[PDB]
Design a protein around this ligand. Sequence first.
Ligand SMILES: [Fe+3]
Ligand SMILES: [Fe+3]
Ligand SMILES: [Fe+3]
Ligand SMILES: [Fe+3]
Ligand SMILES: [Fe+3]
Ligand SMILES: [Fe+3]
Ligand SMILES: [Fe+3]
Ligand SMILES: [Fe+3]
Ligand SMILES: [Fe+3]
Ligand SMILES: [Fe+3]
Ligand SMILES: [Fe+3]
Ligand SMILES: [Fe+3]
Ligand SMILES: [Fe+3]
Lengths: 125, 118, 120, 117
Amino acid sequence: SHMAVELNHTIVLVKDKDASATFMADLLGLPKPKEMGPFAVLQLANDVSILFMDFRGEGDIVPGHCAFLISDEEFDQIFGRIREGGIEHWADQYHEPGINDGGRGVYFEDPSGHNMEIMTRPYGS
Amino acid sequence: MAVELNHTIVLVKDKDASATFMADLLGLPKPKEMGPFAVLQLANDVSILFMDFDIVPGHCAFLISDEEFDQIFGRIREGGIEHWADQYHREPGRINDDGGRGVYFEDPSGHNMEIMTR
Amino acid sequence: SHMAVELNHTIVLVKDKDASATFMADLLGLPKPKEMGPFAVLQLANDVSILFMDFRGDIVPGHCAFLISDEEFDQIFGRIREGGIEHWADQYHREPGRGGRGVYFEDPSGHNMEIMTRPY
Amino acid sequence: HMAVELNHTIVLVKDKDASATFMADLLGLPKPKEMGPFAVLQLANDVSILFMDDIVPGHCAFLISDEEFDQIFGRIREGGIEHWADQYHREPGRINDRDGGRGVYFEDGHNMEIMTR
Ligand SMILES: [Fe+3]
Ligand SMILES: [Fe+3]
Ligand SMILES: [Fe+3]
Ligand SMILES: [Fe+3]
Ligand SMILES: [Fe+3]
Ligand SMILES: [Fe+3]
Ligand SMILES: [Fe+3]
Ligand SMILES: [Fe+3]
Ligand SMILES: [Fe+3]
Ligand SMILES: [Fe+3]
Ligand SMILES: [Fe+3]
Ligand SMILES: [Fe+3]
Ligand SMILES: [Fe+3]
């Protein structure tokens, strides 16, 4: 025992759990999502997973988002794709359109309309 | 492989009742208010950002030690907090046992939670 | 393939690798270090390990820095301050005594460390 | 268990700029940033190496893809960079196949390792 409390996983309701999970895994460079029960499961590096679940309702309102921390080099590579592919993006969590500046950030939506953010935290930030 | 989830926003009816309850259930400080959020920081480089304005089997799950599980579950039971062994809230009154223990419950905003040891 | 380059481990030369590794593991709440070859191994959460190696022979502002919740920070710094462990607010050890937080200190081998927070 | 992360570590070298520039270009990383007394090389797993102005078997080791190993090893071999299969630099001109992966050690005189696991 004696560990400190961790966030281990959270369920995110989206219009299409498979479109959402595939988009997120492919954009962030993660392996193919796993199917578990009603969920499409995406594991992140800091001992936490996102479990996408089908939900036809509204789903996520700004300034809600899930934010992913990546290196400056991965930020440049993902943002370059988030530009050639016509992904809408915003500099702020309230969505402005067309990045944030210690660190950088950019916000965008997945195919289900789930709000995302990629952000950096370089040394000296 | 290296990407981390740094923070996630959780929509609740009242961000302050939810965050304050969770921090005192989990032995965390008094939450910090940042922008429109009530912030709960966890140990694994991630925070939950509660925001004003939960459908089963959705939940937020926390991995904790066996000793903190015993203490939180004791609080739940002595405090009369409804709890279930399953994410569908179909098995009230019990915990579950994958080499670990787990139990599901709701916070005062009706948000679904889970604590687990494995 | 296609992963991005990661720092997987680094070897740190100290007077006593076992005193250093056990001190570090017990202070940061990590499991007991493992012995591998000539090294005492401490694994951290972000897929990187420190391998301590015995060396008769760290200078400021050099250090190894560990990121923790503020809050385990309060718990570890509580140990540092109540236990009389010398500490400084700066990497040059010119400010003894003591957004995010940080504090610098030495392990029993004289290896320079830092614990730091990065809250939302 | 464990949640503590290694966020940065300072590496002592004769010339911080030669080391950081060499490593970033060899590993396919962007240009290093200079901050205070350090030359900063950021890696993907929420950690940075801070070079500041090394004895075998000490080294710094990088986990990389199979494809990046081929490109770095190609640079090493076509570029004449001395390399060894072992951390003691006793097996020159060889790579290791540890754990089904591939690995090689080399000097920049600071000791490095790349591995694919
Ligand atoms: Fe963990
Ligand atoms: Fe989200
Ligand atoms: Fe954010
Ligand atoms: Fe939740
Ligand atoms: Fe769960
Ligand atoms: Fe319920
Ligand atoms: Fe890794
Ligand atoms: Fe160090
Ligand atoms: Fe530092
Ligand atoms: Fe991290
Ligand atoms: Fe090194
Ligand atoms: Fe090595
Ligand atoms: Fe050599």
